[PDB]
């Protein structure tokens, strides 16, 4: 409506305090040229971006104006599971105040969304999500300060009768993807760049859709992963963002013109059903159709800044004291999903660890679908996936596993208490692919 490029409204802390009341409410709005009622925080889709600095106080009162219970997960924030409480239920009509201090050693793009087990997928799909940006002193170095910065919330949607389409049985098996492939709730927006270097914060807030990102004629310079900066920029030709992952990239516009940002074809192992004679058997859907995410218009005679030579040194972690093995398996036709052969039970503790120790987690995907594995509260360092060493050091909290692959994670245990790990194809979490970690 206003600036060519739609981005969520930003709410900033004031004098070190971000005090805000958000309502979760069915909201009529215009989206992608049609009128629809979505479930929104703060009356908008996506919800407002919260922008804070380390050591700020966040005081967020969530008013539940939905007809079902809900809660908030502060995705990626290494804060206490007593605040980021995955078992809390806020009944319809009730409110709850989340109060926490932003950790001192923290930077990057995080997000908030519901985490009430069994109702996550319908609520997230309906529009309940927003970003949280932790700004850092590193944002003052000239190579970042002088770049043009934008948030890109990647989230798809399907509408039916002016509401989010309901989940089908097949949706619970695959994770629901929609035909409206949106950026900040907008359909294929145009970004008319004014600076030759762009700094793009990227958030995959979809239930299940993957974004194999590629900018026409350009590489991307990765500078942050889910939970923090890399140590130095990493040049990549494309960047896969699984559900729940974040990244930040620098884009260095090489010449005038129009360049498409696309989600290239990607096969995550979703399944259909076919009947060819007697059959009635499951069959791969194959790769996603390519999608145009936005149009990027370069400015006249672009002369991008030099890349930063360094970002943030990654901490040297203490030697680990235990190795864990978590195997992921599937029962596709039952839409049931397991970790070490079990479905979630909120009464059952599955792993018991010691705060301020480091653990090695070997997560093995023995299913046929991609599974993006997420751990609350305790960001990790991905060492390797599928036997390939990871090409950078940075904090992550979601790691994608293709079929058969093992991820080896270095997991420093931070805040004490009971938290969860789960697949971030949230339909799979709702259907049991989640476990309980207790840190003492």
Q: Parallel, antiparallel, or unpaired: how do β-strands 434-439 and 351-353 relate?
A: parallel
* Nearest distance, CB of residue 35 and Cu ion, angstroms: 29
Q: Would you give the binding string for Cu ion spanning residues 97-116, x where CB under 5 A is met? A: ------------------x-
State which residue, 203 or 382, has the beta carbon closest to Cu ion: 203
> Of 44, 428, 431, 436, which one interacts with Cu ion (CB under 5 A)?
428
Is 425 an interacting residue with respect to Cu ion (CB under 5 A)?
Answer: yes
- Count the alpha carbons within 13 Å of 83 in the hemisphere toward its beta carbon: 21
State which residue, 396 or 428, has the beta carbon closest to Cu ion: 428
218 is in an annotated binding site: no
DSSP SS3 for 342: strand
Choose the stretch contacting Cu ion; rule: CB under 5 A; options: 201-209, 215-223, 233-241, 422-430.
422-430
State which residue, 115 or 212, has the beta carbon closest to Cu ion: 115
Give me the helices (H) in 21-163, please.
120-126, 142-145
150 is in an annotated binding site: no
* Nearest distance, CB of residue 280 and Cu ion, angstroms: 11
* Nearest distance, CB of residue 255 and Cu ion, angstroms: 38
Q: Would you give the binding string for Cu ion spanning residues 262-301, x where CB under 5 A is met? A: ---------x----------x-------------------
Dist CA 339 CA 349 (whole Å): 13
167 is in an annotated binding site: no
> Of 423, 436, 437, 439, which one interacts with Cu ion (CB under 5 A)?
423
378 is in an annotated binding site: no
Choose the stretch contacting Cu ion; rule: CB under 5 A; options: 94-102, 221-229, 368-376, 389-397.
368-376
* Nearest distance, CB of residue 424 and Cu ion, angstroms: 6
Choose the stretch contacting Cu ion; rule: CB under 5 A; options: 8-16, 74-82, 182-190, 232-240.
74-82
* Nearest distance, CB of residue 371 and Cu ion, angstroms: 4
Dist CA 389 CA 408 (whole Å): 9
Dist CA 339 CA 411 (whole Å): 18
* Nearest distance, CB of residue 306 and Cu ion, angstroms: 35
376 is in an annotated binding site: yes
What Cα–Cα distance (Å) separates residue 425 from each residue in 252, 299, 431? 32, 38, 10
Q: Would you give the binding string for Cu ion spanning residues 147-186, x where CB under 5 A is met? A: -----------------------x----------------
ω into residue 139 within 30 of 0, thus cis? Answer: no
Q: How many residues in total does the chain contain? A: 440
Is 332 an interacting residue with respect to Cu ion (CB under 5 A)?
Answer: yes
117 is in an annotated binding site: no
Dist CA 376 CA 357 (whole Å): 16
Q: Parallel, antiparallel, or unpaired: how do β-strands 395-396 and 398-401 relate?
A: unpaired
For residue 354, what is the DSSP state?
A: -
For residue 115, what is the DSSP state?
A: -
Dist CA 243 CA 153 (whole Å): 11
> Of 155, 371, 408, 418, which one interacts with Cu ion (CB under 5 A)?
371
Site for Cu ion (CB under 5 A): how many residues? 11
Choose the stretch contacting Cu ion; rule: CB under 5 A; options: 132-140, 205-213, 242-250, 302-310.
242-250
Is 75 an interacting residue with respect to Cu ion (CB under 5 A)?
Answer: yes
Q: Give pairs for 329-334: CB < 8 Å, separation 24+.
A: 329/366, 329/367, 330/367, 330/368, 330/369, 332/173, 332/271, 332/282, 332/368, 333/173, 333/282
* Nearest distance, CB of residue 170 and Cu ion, angstroms: 2
Is 377 an interacting residue with respect to Cu ion (CB under 5 A)?
Answer: no
For 130, residues 6+ apart whose C-beta sits below 8 A from its C-beta are 8, 41, 42, 46, 47, 48, 49, 50, 111, 112, 113
Dist CA 191 CA 195 (whole Å): 11
> Of 78, 108, 185, 244, which one interacts with Cu ion (CB under 5 A)?
244
Q: Which residues bind Cu ion (CB under 5 A)?
A: 75, 115, 170, 244, 271, 282, 332, 371, 423, 425, 428
Binding-site positions for Cu(2+) read: 73, 75, 113, 115, 281, 371, 374, 376, 422-424, 428
């Amino acid at each position: 409506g206003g600036p060519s490029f739609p981005e969520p409204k930003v709410v900033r802390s004031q004098g070190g305090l971000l005090s805000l009341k958000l309502s979760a409410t069915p909201t009529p709005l215009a989206i992608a040229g049609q009128r629809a009622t979505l479930l929104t925080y703060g009356g908008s889709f996506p919800g407002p971006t919260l922008r804070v600095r380390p050591r700020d106080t966040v005081r967020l009162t969530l008013e539940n104006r939905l007809p079902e219970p809900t809660n908030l997960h502060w995705h990626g924030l290494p804060i206490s599971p007593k605040v980021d409480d995955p078992f809390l239920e806020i009944p319809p009509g009730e409110s709850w105040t989340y109060e926490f201090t932003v950790p001192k050693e923290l930077a990057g793009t995080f997000w908030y969304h519901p985490h009430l087990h069994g109702r996550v997928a319908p609520q997230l799909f309906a529009g309940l999500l927003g970003a949280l940006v932790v700004e850092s002193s590193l944002d003052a170095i000239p190579e970042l300060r002088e770049a043009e910065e934008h948030l890109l919330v990647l989230k798809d949607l399907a509408l039916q009768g002016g509401r989010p389409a309901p989940h089908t049985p097949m949706d619970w098996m695959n994770g629901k993807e929609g035909d409206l492939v949106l950026v900040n709730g907008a359909l294929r927006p145009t970004l008319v760049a004014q600076k030759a270097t762009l700094r793009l914060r990227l958030l995959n807030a979809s239930n299940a859709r993957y974004y194999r990102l590629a900018l026409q004629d350009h590489p991307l310079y990765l500078i942050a992963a889910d939970g923090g900066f890399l140590e130095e920029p990493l040049e990549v030709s494309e960047l896969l963002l699984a559900p729940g992952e974040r990244a930040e990239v620098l884009v260095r516009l090489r010449k005038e013109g129009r360049f498409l940002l696309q989600a290239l074809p990607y096969d995550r192992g979703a399944m259909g059903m076919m009947d060819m004679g007697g059959m009635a058997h499951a069959m791969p859907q194959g790769p996603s159709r390519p999608e145009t995410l936005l149009y990027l218009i370069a400015p006249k005679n672009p002369k991008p800044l030099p890349l930063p030579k360094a970002l943030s040194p990654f901490p040297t972690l203490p030697a680990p004291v235990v190795t864990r093995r978590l195997v992921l398996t599937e029962d596709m036709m039952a839409a049931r999903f397991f970790i070490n052969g079990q479905v979630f039970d909120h009464r059952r503790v599955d792993l018991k660890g010691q705060a301020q120790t480091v653990e090695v987690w070997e997560v093995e995907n023995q299913g046929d679908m991609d599974h993006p594995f997420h751990l609350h509260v305790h960001p990790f360092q991905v060492l390797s996936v599928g036997g390939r060493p990871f090409p950078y050091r940075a904090w992550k909290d979601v790691v994608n596993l293709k079929a058969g692959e093992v991820a080896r994670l270095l997991v420093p245990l931070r805040e004490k208490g009971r938290t969860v790990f789960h697949c971030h194809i949230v339909e799979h979490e709702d259907r049991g692919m989640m476990g309980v970690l207790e840190v003492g």
